[PDB]
Amino acid sequence: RCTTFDDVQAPNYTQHTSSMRGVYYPDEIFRSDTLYLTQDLFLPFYSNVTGFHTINHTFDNPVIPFKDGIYFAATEKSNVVRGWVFGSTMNNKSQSVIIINNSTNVVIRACNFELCDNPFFAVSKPMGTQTHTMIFDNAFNCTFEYISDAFSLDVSEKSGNFKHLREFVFKNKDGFLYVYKGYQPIDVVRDLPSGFNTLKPIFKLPLGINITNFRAILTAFSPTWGTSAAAYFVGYLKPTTFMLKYDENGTITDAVDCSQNPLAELKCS
Ligand SMILES: *[C@@H]1O[C@H](CO)[C@@H](O[C@@H]2O[C@H](CO)[C@@H](O)[C@H](O)[C@H]2NC(C)=O)[C@H](O)[C@H]1NC(C)=O
Ligand SMILES: *[C@@H]1O[C@H](CO)[C@@H](O)[C@H](O)[C@H]1NC(C)=O
C-alpha cells in the first residue's frame, strides 16, 4: 500500500556549490606516487549543485534525471536519507533497482517494482523506532538480489548540527551501475561544506538496466506525517579532464580540474 502526504510544500531547488568534491578513484588500477591525467565523467570544481532540503512541511523527493551519472551528498544527524530508486519510467512497466538501508540490512533489489510515488520509511518520534517501510506495493521479474549482513542502526531523531556527510557517485557504464562512496564528519546547520574527499568504489552492479531517472528514499518522523531536518545534494557528472595526484601511499590526496581556468590548464598544473 502506497501513501501520499497531505500538504507538502513544493521543492525550492536551492543552488549550492560542489567546491572540490566528487573526486573518485576512476578505476581499479593501483597507481602510486604519480600524477594521472584522464578524461572521464567528473563533477567540475565549484559546479552548481541542487539542494533538496527536508524540514517542516517540506519533504523533497521528486523524480530527478540521472543523465550521465550523479554526485549525491547527504548532510545527516537522524539518518533521514536512506536510499534511492534508480530506473526510467519509475513504473512497473520497466526495471528499477532499489538501494536502501532499512535500519538492519543494506538491500539492493532490481525488479519490475510497483513503486510508491511517495516512498518513505516512517519512524515514531516519541518511541524512536522505525514503524513503517512503504516503498513499493508489488514486484515481479526480479533480476538482482543483495542483502547485507545484519546490523543495528540508530533510527531515532537527533538534535543539533548535522554530524555526518555521506557522499556517493553513481555511474551507468558498460552495463554496470558503479556506486562510489565516501564519508566524513561535519557539524553544520545548512549547506554543503567546502572540502575535498575522494570516493571509493563500493559496488559494481551487473544490472544492465536503463537508468534515466532516480528518486531519493527518505524518512518521515511521526508522533499523519512529519519531518526531521535533513538535506541531500545532486550534482551532474560531465566529461572533463582531471589530473589526479596519487600519493606515495596510493591515495588520491589532490586533484586539478583542468577546465577550471588556464592556470589549472597548465597541462595541467
Ligand atoms: C530489512 O530488510 C531485510 C531483508 O528483507 C529484512 O530481513 C528479512 O526479514 C524477513 C522478515 O521481515 C525474514 O523472513 C528474512 O529472513 C530476513 N532476511 C535476512 C537476511 O535477515 C529485515 O527484517 C528488514 N529490517 C527492517 C527493520 O524492516
Ligand atoms: C502494476 O502492475 C499491476 C499488474 O501487473 C497493475 O494492476 C498495477 O496497476 C500496476 N501499478 C500501478 C501503480 O498501476
Author numbering: 18 to 240, 244 to 289
From the paper:
The key determinant of host specificity is the envelope-located trimeric spike (S) glycoprotein, which can be further cleaved by host proteases into an N-terminal S1 subunit and a membrane-bound C-terminal S2 region. In the S1 subunit, the receptor binding domain (RBD, also called the C terminal domain, CTD) is localized in the C-terminal region, spanning ∼200 amino acids, and structural studies have revealed that the RBD consists of two subdomains: the core and external subdomains. For both MERS-CoV and SARS-CoV S proteins, the S2 subunit is mainly composed of α-helices and forms the stem region of the S protein. Here we present high-resolution structures of the trimeric MERS-CoV and SARS-CoV S proteins in its pre-fusion conformation by single particle cryo-electron microscopy (cryo-EM).
To date, little is known about the structural and functional information of NTDs for the MERS-CoV or SARS-CoV S proteins, though its counterparts from other CoVs, such as mouse hepatitis virus (MHV) and bovine coronavirus (BCoV), act as receptor binding domains and their crystal structures have already been delineated. We also solved the crystal structure of the NTD at a resolution of 2.2 Å. Our crystal and cryo-EM structures show that MERS-CoV and SARS-CoV NTDs fold into galectin-like structures as in BCoV, MHV and HKU1CoV. By contrast, the NTD domain is observed with strong and clear density, forming a stable triangular platform on the top of the S trimer. The flexible RBD regions are located on the triangular edges between the NTD domains. Since the RBD is located between the NTD domains, a strategy to develop neutralizing antibodies, which target the NTD and interfering with receptor binding through steric hindrance should be feasible in the future.
